Amino acid sequence: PMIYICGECHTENEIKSRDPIRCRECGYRIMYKKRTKRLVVFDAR
């Protein structure tokens, strides 16, 4: 369930191995990975 948001459509595309990297509902060629809930620790200094 690796999601990628389109560049201007903003549709969640899930891509894999061996498949092209175009976007559904459009045809753009740039897609940003999505932020999942993972724990990271930062210091307030």
Partner: protein, 337 residues
């Protein structure tokens, strides 16, 4: 053959001297061996104001070294509680993660630091004894009940602006007892933490530890705690006849009160304390010879303004006690030999 025992005289091109002549051997007879009773007799504390978050006591009759010790204790050695670690589960905001952690560290918490203790080195976990945990979890959604409008609060708004109200205390241990429901909270409920747009979410856990304003400013409990020596203004000559008003304008306005003793107008020094040193008489060229303005020797004026963690009087008390604790620590380490 003329002694001036109490004032720090001053002109324009520089101040005259940096001494106070109240130490051992500093005079033929006016020698000192630290008479404790003379101190306890000549010392007096007077408070000009005490709103909440303000104090303006006087502290008459103490040296500059002790006053400066008190001032430096309030700024950098009285302990406070503040966010040290931030665990970020998700953060789809425009504000970065490190910048969010920074902004969260500088938010003042209302926990009193005297009921807590310092986390031992490498105590990452923490316990009811040394830590407080708070949670901010907010998501922005469009409101379904909105017309074609553009005010950001009316539409595009369930949580457009994340405030300190959104932060919720997670009682860590038995701290729910000991601390009643409203006692442990951020001091201000309106501090803007971030801004969100529909679909954006913040979710994090903040850990607050104890510390002094010396190793980081976030832990400092006062806006400012400075002091100023009491000004002294003396009219060497009776100013009158429309020069009294020019005199009254060369000073902070309350200092020279122009009375009307006769048909003519006399200027009198009503309240020397209001004076800000602006030395604007020294530009007058005819009245720089009439007024002498200096400072009272050991008469201070303090002003402590807390952020909201503790009241100012409690802050001053804990500062004096921190100085006493330094002295006692070194006394007892000396007695260890």
């Amino acid at each position: 053959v003329e002694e001036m025992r109490s004032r720090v005289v001053l002109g324009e091109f520089g101040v005259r001297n940096v001494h106070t002549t109240d130490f051992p051997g500093n005079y033929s007879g006016y020698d000192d061996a630290w008479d404790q009773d003379r101190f306890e007799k000549n010392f007096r504390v007077d408070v000009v104001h005490m709103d909440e978050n303000s104090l303006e006591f006087d502290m008459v009759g103490i040296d500059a070294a002790i006053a400066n010790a008190f001032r430096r204790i309030l700024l950098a050695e009285v302990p406070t509680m503040a966010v040290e670690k931030v665990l970020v589960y998700n953060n789809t905001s425009i504000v970065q993660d490190e910048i969010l952690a920074h902004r969260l560290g500088l938010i003042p918490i209302h926990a009193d630091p005297r009921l807590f203790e310092y986390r031992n080195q490498g105590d990452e976990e923490g316990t009811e004894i040394d830590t407080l945990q708070f949670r901010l979890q907010v998501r922005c959604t469009r409101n379904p009940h909105a017309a074609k409008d553009s005010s950001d609060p009316n539409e595009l708004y369930v949580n457009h602006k994340v405030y300190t109200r959104h932060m919720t205390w997670i009682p860590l241990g038995n701290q729910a007892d000991l601390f009643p429901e409203g006692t442990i909270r951020p001091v201000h409920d309106d501090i803007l933490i971030a801004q969100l747009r529909p679909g954006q979410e913040i979710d994090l856990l903040m850990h607050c530890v104890k510390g002094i304003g010396k190793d980081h400013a976030k832990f400092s409990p006062v806006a400012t705690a400075s002091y100023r020596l009491l000004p002294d203004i003396t009219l060497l000559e009776p100013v009158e006849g429309e020069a009294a008003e020019e005199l009254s304008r060369c000073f902070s306005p309350g200092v020279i009160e122009v009375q009307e003793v006769q048909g003519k107008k006399v200027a009198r020094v009503a309240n020397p304390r209001l004076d800000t040193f602006s030395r604007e008489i020294f530009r007058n060229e005819k009245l720089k010879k009439v007024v002498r303005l200096a400072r009272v020797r050991d008469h201070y004026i303090f002003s402590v303004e807390s952020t909201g963690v503790l009241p100012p009087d409690v802050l001053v008390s804990e500062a004096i006690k921190v100085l006493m604790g330094k002295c006692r620590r070194f006394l007892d380490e000396l007695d260890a030999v």
